[PDB]
């Protein structure tokens, strides 16, 4: 009963285009395929904009004011968005492939590099009401005879330097009156000109060619004309210049090459400040910070985005996205971290708060099919198409054990006992479930009974029963633990593809080929529910289909399903353009999401395989925090969250309940009534206001008197608020009073508070415990020095 919205894209940082630093220099804007992602370097946070282009992004630019962001795809279709409010402003089609877009430093105008044509336009006023036809073109310029590589602005918004493949660097004047000042074409280079820049005084013009030659241009008497006073050459053995940028204030030259290295130089002395190698793949894009101390670099082949602090030779940001599509994902039990697996065979660990890759694992040779955590969370397990199952310790980040079958069985699914002592995997070729022992590393036994490939596996969290699903049209319930082993088969209408186990461990839902999510009672082994999915699923006709989408039967089933931790919802996904969120007890569609809107993805709308990318979700799990869910797709990890909470959902509201009345109760010192009335309104700002304004003395009195119905909601509020809040001692005192006063009620009903309790332990374990660890170490680091005798 919550509204989920797209928040950020994980597993993925950069594809192509030009990286742009925010004017403040504390944020980095990177185009991510069909969307654009922003990374907060100072705060170590990231978000991906909700708006989506028709095709992949080609060029972007942010104005110095930080209010207007312009993005253009490969078709020339531009999207203007308010950077601050993250809302789209206007949609325009330039009807041409725009190589580069750059705002004027004054901000009134922005220039477009279009083929051999330079277009200069007027920037709309954000303060004005949303205008229907705000784009008016200031002028259009064309002297080049070939495509423009790039353009550069003068610091004074009066002249533009443009470089093309005509082996010429050429200048304009933004003002018609000032045309006589700057109407020169600079020549001399032997290959394509990559970048033309002004000096800080603008007296000098530096032009760089693809061959690796930098020409210094100065006005001089031979009466006065531009001449090349100095020539510098980059003596790269074969590397060609790929991208160049310049910072007039500090005189820094950053050049990215095709060989995958870059060099930093101080002009006009041509002093090599530093040379490092970015890899074997070309350095596609380069940018400089406003201050000039941070350098952002980008290579398209491996999805590469790096930020370098050349001052201290330190790395601000260093993150890689998956080369292939992510095949599976798994959350940590607390939800602080998420692990992703790709078809390459590499596993990556990602931090939800920062959104950055903490670690990567390269041990698996082939594609990693499934990833899962133990209940405790210290250990992680993964299965791969190399024929091995590997266990990972995520405190020291080591593969402490590896598992494999006798004949190298190919594994596609994996399940782990809650005790973390038994691991079971399934295969498409063997029809058998291999069982191992975690501690010893041997094959305990093979669970036989399926006449078809095992499609999915899962251990009940509480009861520890194993439920297995297979294309053999049935589901088998294994009581492996105990003196005697029993198997209870429940036959199913059609081929089962995915399986989800209730956190209670009392029920199991399964998605079948017919497009049905059937829910069975584990103890009684009888059906209790069923939901139709055929109609709700959205599948787009692929470009090569000779049969219509409505008649098509390619994918109207869900290949992945998971439960909500509360237990009343199912999120389902498959080889389609839809994620559907259903409600289990009453069997409807709560809401549906469109995973992508790019035409280049096939499903959005004789010896050679016609073979192109398709839109799909491989796996979808709920966040244990019960505020977000992640979907693994080709583009990357799409995390949809409920954080904004703009919606108004009062609970048990009455006429007497009002925000003003709640404040009046606070002024009258009726803290208990104010807190209850605020929670009835369900407004976070009012829920927050009452929360601090109560004194510490009155906390135990209020906590003991909270109604039981509001208890789970206050505990959830504290846990999510405390994770990022600064009032550690204040928030803890609430956790003391609530647990002390209502702790017995929590024990009686563990599952009602399961999510709220978990959020609390995350706060106290991941930040509160760390603070005391430093505090005690300083206390002990204190004591040794004073008591110990000083050296002679």
């Amino acid at each position: 009963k919550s509204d989920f919205k797209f928040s950020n894209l994980l597993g993925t940082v950069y594809r192509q285009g030009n990286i742009t630093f925010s004017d403040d220099g504390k944020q980095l804007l990177s185009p991510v395929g069909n969307r654009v992602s922003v990374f907060d370097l100072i705060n170590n946070k990231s978000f991906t904009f909700e708006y989506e282009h028709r095709k992949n992004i080609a060029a972007i630019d942010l104005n110095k004011q930080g209010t207007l962001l312009i993005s253009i795809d490969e078709d020339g279709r531009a999207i203007l968005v308010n950077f601050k409010a993250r809302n789209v402003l206007h949609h325009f089609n330039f009807k041409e492939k725009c190589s580069a877009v750059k705002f004027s430093p004054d901000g009134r105008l922005f220039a477009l590099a279009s083929g051999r044509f330079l277009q200069i336009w007027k920037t709309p006023d954000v303060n004005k009401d949303r205008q229907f036809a705000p784009f008016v073109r200031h002028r259009v310029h064309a002297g080049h005879f070939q495509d423009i590589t790039s353009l550069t602005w003068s610091q004074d918004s009066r002249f533009i330097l443009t470089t093309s493949k005509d082996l010429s660097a050429k200048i304009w004047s933004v003002d018609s009156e000032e045309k006589n000042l700057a109407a020169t074409t600079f020549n001399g280079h032997r290959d394509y000109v990559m970048g033309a820049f002004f000096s800080h005084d603008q007296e000098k013009i530096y032009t760089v060619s693809k061959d690796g030659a930098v020409f210094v241009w100065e006005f001089t008497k031979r009466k006065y004309s531009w001449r090349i006073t100095k020539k510098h050459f980059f003596y790269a053995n074969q590397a060609k210049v790929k991208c160049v940028t310049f910072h007039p204030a500090t005189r820094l030259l950053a050049v990215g090459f095709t060989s995958g290295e870059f060099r930093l130089y101080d002009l006009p002395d041509f002093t090599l400040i530093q040379q490092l190698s970015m890899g074997q793949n070309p350095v596609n894009t380069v940018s400089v910070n406003q201050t000039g101390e941070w350098l952002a670099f980008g290579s398209s082949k491996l999805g590469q985005l790096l930020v370098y602090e050349w001052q201290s030779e330190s790395y601000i940001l260093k993150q890689q996205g998956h080369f292939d599509s992510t095949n599976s994902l798994a959350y940590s039990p607390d939800g602080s971290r998420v692990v992703t697996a790709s078809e390459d065979g590499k596993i990556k660990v990602w931090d939800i708060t920062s959104g950055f890759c903490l670690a990567t694992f390269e041990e698996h040779t082939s594609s990693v099919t499934a990833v899962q955590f133990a209940k405790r969370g210290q250990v992680m397990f993964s299965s791969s198409l190399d024929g091995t199952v590997r266990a990972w310790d995520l405190i020291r980040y080591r593969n402490f054990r590896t598992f494999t079958g006798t004949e190298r069985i190919q594994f596609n699914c994996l399940a782990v006992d809650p005790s973390g002592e038994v691991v079971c995997a399934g295969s498409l070729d063997n029809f058998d479930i291999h069982v191992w022992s975690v501690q010893t590393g041997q094959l305990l036994d093979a669970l036989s009974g399926h006449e078809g490939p095992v499609s999915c596996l899962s251990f009940s969290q509480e009861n520890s029963v194993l439920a297995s699903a297979s294309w053999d049209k049935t589901i088998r319930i294994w009581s492996i633990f105990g003196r005697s082993q029993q198997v209870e088969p429940i036959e199913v209408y059609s081929d089962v593809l995915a399986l989800s186990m209730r956190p209670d461990g009392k029920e199991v839902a399964v998605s079948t080929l017919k497009g049905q999510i059937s829910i069975f009672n584990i103890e009684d082994a009888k059906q209790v529910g069923n939901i139709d999915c055929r109609k709700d699923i959205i599948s787009g006709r692929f470009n090569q289909d000779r049969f219509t989408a409505k008649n098509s039967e390619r994918s109207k089933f869900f290949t992945t399903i998971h439960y909500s931790f509360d237990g009343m919802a199912i999120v389902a996904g498959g080889n389609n353009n839809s994620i559907c969120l259903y409600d289990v007890p009453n069997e409807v569609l709560l809401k549906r999401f469109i995973v992508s809107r790019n035409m280049a993805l096939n499903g959005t709308l004789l010896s050679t395989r016609k073979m192109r990318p398709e839109v799909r979700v491989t796996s979808v799990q709920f966040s244990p925090t019960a505020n977000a869910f992640a979907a693994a797709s080709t583009e990357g990890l799409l995390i949809y969250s409920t954080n904004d909470t703009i919606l108004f959902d009062p609970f048990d509201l009455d006429v007497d309940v009002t925000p003003h009345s709640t404040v009046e109760a606070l002024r009258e010192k009726q803290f208990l009534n104010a807190l209850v009335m605020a929670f009835r309104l369900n407004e976070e700002y009012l829920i927050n206001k009452v929360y601090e304004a109560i004194p510490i003395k009155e906390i135990p009195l209020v906590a003991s008197n909270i109604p039981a119905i509001y208890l789970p909601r206050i505990l959830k509020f504290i846990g999510d608020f405390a994770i990022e809040s600064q009032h550690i001692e204040f928030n803890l005192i609430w956790i003391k009073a609530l647990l002390s006063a209502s702790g017995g009620y929590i024990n009686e009903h563990k599952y009602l508070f399961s999510t709220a309790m978990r959020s609390i332990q995350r706060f106290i374990v991941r930040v509160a415990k760390e603070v005391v660890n430093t505090t005690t170490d300083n206390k002990y680091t204190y004591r040794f020095l004073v008591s110990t005798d000083g050296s002679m």
């Binding site: 003068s154 002249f159 200048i171 006589n180 000042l181 700057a182 603008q202 007296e203 013009i205 006005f219």
Partner: peptide, 16 residues
């Protein structure tokens, strides 16, 4: 000026 324009030496010899 260009049209696009805006608008002691310490000796290194030391004894040892």
């Amino acid at each position: 000026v260009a049209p696009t324009a805006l608008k002691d030496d310490d000796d290194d010899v030391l004894l040892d």
